[PDB]
């Protein structure tokens, strides 16, 4: 499967994943809103944002 893996609002980049869902994860630290993108569908802490999707390049 093919997922975005670029951080926050850096330039779009993608990656091949042996998983079937992609993820977009977002939280607040002293920098502001931070976004992580990758392969899979991880558990996150309460309050943290997580979008897992079944398509390709869905985690924009």
């Amino acid at each position, epitope marked *: 499967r093919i997922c975005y893996n670029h951080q926050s609002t850096t330039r779009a980049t993608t990656k091949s994943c042996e998983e079937n869902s992609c993820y977009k994860k977002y939280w607040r630290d002293h*920098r502001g809103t931070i976004i992580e993108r990758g392969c899979g569908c991880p558990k996150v802490k309460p*309050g943290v944002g997580i979008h897992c999707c079944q398509s390709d390049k869905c985690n924009y």
Partner: antibody
Amino acid sequence: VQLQESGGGVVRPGGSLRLSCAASGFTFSSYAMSWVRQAPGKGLEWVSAISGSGGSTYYADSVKGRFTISRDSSKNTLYLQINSLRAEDTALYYCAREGDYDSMDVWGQGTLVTVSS
Amino acid sequence: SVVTQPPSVSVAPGKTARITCGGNNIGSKSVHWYQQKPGQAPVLVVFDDSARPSGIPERFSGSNSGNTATLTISRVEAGDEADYYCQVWDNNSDDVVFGGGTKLTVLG
């Protein structure tokens, strides 16, 4: 990647000091930066942090309204302005580069502030 | 949130050291661990509960659930003697909370 603090020394209670931290080997403005202090023989105490742009600042309750954090991207330098100094501000002052979840992945060697009349 | 570390832990070389960081619902927060040797700056050894920065030995492992986060140092060595600090991140507040530190003695 390096951080180097300066500006510490002996200062009177009710006095003022400006601490500086010179950063190198990374894109300075992409990272939040923190000041953390440590009294001799005591634990780490977070003092203040600042977003990449300087648009957000954050302070410990103990220092609200006496300390000001600022940065200058052109000089790759972080500052801490410490006013109305108290005995309890005596500490080694570290600057740190933050990462994910305010983890502090790079530290300087610290600058010593001694508050005495 | 007050976070509680034991002031000291002693372990024989080769044994496993466990340093705890206690706080109500710390399991819902993210915990980092620092190593500080005397006259040195802190070094990040675990971040986000269980991740290891590159160059940190595999003997250093973290966990976090419920009211307890733990730094576990397996096969402890004389060179691991240090003060250890936990740091708690919470998505819903700004303040940086550190535990009071734990002195790890490696018993020689």
